[model samples]
Target chain A: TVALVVEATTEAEAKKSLREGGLVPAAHEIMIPVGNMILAVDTQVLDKCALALAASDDPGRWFAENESLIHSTVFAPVAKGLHRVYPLLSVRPEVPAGYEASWPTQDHMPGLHLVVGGTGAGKSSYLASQDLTLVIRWGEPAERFDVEGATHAVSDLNEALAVAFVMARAGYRPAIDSFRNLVFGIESGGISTALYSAMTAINNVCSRLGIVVMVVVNPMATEAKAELVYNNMAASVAGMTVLMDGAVSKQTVRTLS
Target chain B: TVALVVEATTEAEAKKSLREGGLVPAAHEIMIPVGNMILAVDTQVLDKCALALAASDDPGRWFAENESLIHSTVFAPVAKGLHRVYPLLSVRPEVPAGYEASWPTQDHMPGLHLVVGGTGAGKSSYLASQDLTLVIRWGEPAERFDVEGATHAVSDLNEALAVAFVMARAGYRPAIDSFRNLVFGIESAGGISTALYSAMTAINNVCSRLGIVVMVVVNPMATEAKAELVYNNMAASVAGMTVLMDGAVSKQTVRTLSGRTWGVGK
Candidate 1:
């Protein structure tokens, strides 16, 4: 019923807490309650822990069989569905002409901003105006916003996260172009808690550098699905939340500090 | 949001309703809204409908690749987790003696009853007293309730449903021994709507025969998980709801047909 990640000052203290709460944990553990017993993934590794949670069984074995299920369920559908909006992602490795780094801006706020809107609601247009240095384009935005900045379009979430961090560390104002793919990926892969750790890791550096990042979510996602993604964002990187509703062609923004 | 099974009188009528509601449906269809277009499973067959719901994408191809995922996620974990309590299921086809038809009780109330309790809260004992004939065991119950009746321990929901209907039709009072496995199966398989149709199909005949059925649920399942199961049952059967709460060894019974109480939340 409860998904717990136990971080302890000492190994003994962690074990004590875990034991009291009916979780048979190790030194560093992600504990998921399957039925009666705890499915403990004994490591601090995010992918390992996320994969364990995703399988909700023995991660080492279940993931081996179910890795393709993720591809079939989340990745394939997402790629196909968002192909029109994100054509660059479908055609991987070939980026645009202005793919080189630009002078990174310093005036933007740090932490991930969940920029949400329906299609053609000016999410990318708004981000382009903000002088974003690096865009980890999960799906390619429209042709209008393509020329604004450098877009490192990637197919997978892991690849996206890796490039976002790499580009950010190399003094680029990086932002994840969308959260729709990530939401589906996390939901299908069962990696909300692990994703929090990953996001927090991203924010840890980006916060220090004062470089704001964005995760754009389209309108097709139901409120329930977006709510889960928003809750995860709010808990991890408490920053600005923007809604490009496009009724009056304006933005409704809230700053979560 | 809403999973609708549009059962129309005629093809034209069905098409009219589906068109108005943005569902591209045939004569007899299950309409599931994906994003913009409708993923219509054009069939009256429950498995076909359920499989579409399960895949949620293009069911034909998605299911082809992810069939093993269901086995890994739901069936395997369930079989492994419940093997201790339901070892008879592990040792398949080795049903106990007296696995034949019994003179079905004529006095039991028809329809499904969701019997819920903790691991050792006497759910089987309570069911044993109800004069059940065929017990389709998803997982084997403890050794105590093994000798009660014809325990046709099965590995899958399809198998269980087939046996339950066949046995119940052959003059035997039947009950599904547990719901935990089925709950996990349905959740993992994404076939809750399809499962409801299946259950209703079973009840259609059983209700006419006046043979009561039981779906035993253990307390290891969270309130949320059990709530989904309960909501499905409440929507479909609308029968006598019984809670074997295990405090003072008593039962709380509520028949939804006559509930007159309203708006007393403090």
Candidate 2:
């Protein structure tokens, strides 16, 4: 009887090696020299097959294996995002093509989606692309999009959503006009006032819906009263989603989602 | 009838003006004006009549005029430590003197006796004198005499008591020697150790005998701990005298003596 052991410098590398049958068990408990020394062994292919079959989805299946090895192997390939394998059944894209032709019918598409990234990670650019696509598909008029903290893409996406909603609901077109006026006023007057007006509108909507809102702010640049304001917003809107960019980490966002 | 009025500036002058006999009553009141625009009145004597006959020492004789007046006048003089006569006795000079001497023997005297005065007004000196007389007369060498602030003849008196007690007791007199050594050693040491030792010894003695112990100290000038020690000494010797010598005639000490709250500020 023999055993098989696999190791790699990174978790992803280790998982790939294990999947490719590159592991081989030692004659005795010989240490395999990798990044650090690890005890390894070689086993028959039949034994490996049997072991894999015996491994159930239950967490206790790997109780006999070293916990460190199992932990590194299991979570290796996971990336932080809305991960779903099944197409429309499991995950729907934020915006689908031809959504604007029947925009009202496709209202079930997510009205709000959170964009998260570290500093200098192009989160704004991604949001901008989504915004441009919405405008192109819906043929909606250009309203004011306010981008704060070099994150223009997010602001554009948010503006696009407002514009699409206004087009679908008659008499809501004036809201688009007001949005354009507010953006123009902010651009001419100052960024601070424009930002304030945009936040106030968002806060008003969230307050009516009763949603739990989270906002991300830069640690160094964020004001102390931001948390207080966010809490107030949460209380005002029963269930509002207020995602503060730069405030939350990818790990925390994943856990929450 | 005609009116006559005489005025005097000094109290003795006032008494003199009231002594003579040729005065008359007028239909209107007479006013006597003196220095500083103040006024005084001298009344003439009445003839021997029913009023004079009724003004005897009998309680009912002068009950109407003297009752409440006695309350203020009689008590005020004594309260001021003056020489006003009480109804029952003469101004007994030696009675207060004896009271001072046999103060411990008198039940009322052992409790708190608050003394207050101005600087150089002989408060500490008076205390030293009283302590000296008490130790000498009682023949009981103080188990402890915790002297703080100022020491004069009393320290010598204490030394004399120690020597006399030791000589009389004989056989080296350990207790007497210890007491003497503790007090004198502290004095020689030039610090607060002796005062602290005296306080401890006094506390122990007062506790054992359940006797009233008198603590005399000048506050403000003394250390906070020493002041606290005095307060604790009073508490420990609750049945004893807590004599506070203010060494200055401030309203603070008066208020404290009157059992009013005291703090340095207001």
Measured by lDDT, the strongest candidate is 1
Q: Model 2 over residues B147-183: C-alpha lDDT tens digits?
A: 3321212233233222222211221111111223333
Go through the candidates in order and give the C-alpha RMSD of each one to the true structure.
Answer: 21.9, 42.4
Q: What share of the true interface contacts does each candidate keep?
A: 0.00, 0.00
Kindly list the per-residue Cα lDDT of model 1 for residues A108-172, writing each as its tens digit. Answer: 23444556553454665666666765577776545644566466556765455444443444344
TM-scores of chain A across candidates: 0.43, 0.22
Top-scoring candidate (DockQ): 1
Model 1, range B98-207, lDDT digits (tens) per residue?
33321222222344455555334356566666676546654321121322234544433433443443334334455766543333323222223344334333433233
TM-score of 2: 0.17
- Which regions of candidate 1 fall more than 4 Å away from where they truly are? A1-112, A118-121, A141-144, A168-172, A179-212, A219-242, A245-257, B1-264
Runs of candidate 2 exceeding 4 Å displacement: A1-257, B1-221, B224-230, B233-239, B243-266
Which DockQ-derived CAPRI band holds candidate 2?
A: incorrect
Instruction: Give model 2's TM-score for chain A to 2 decimal places.
Output: 0.22
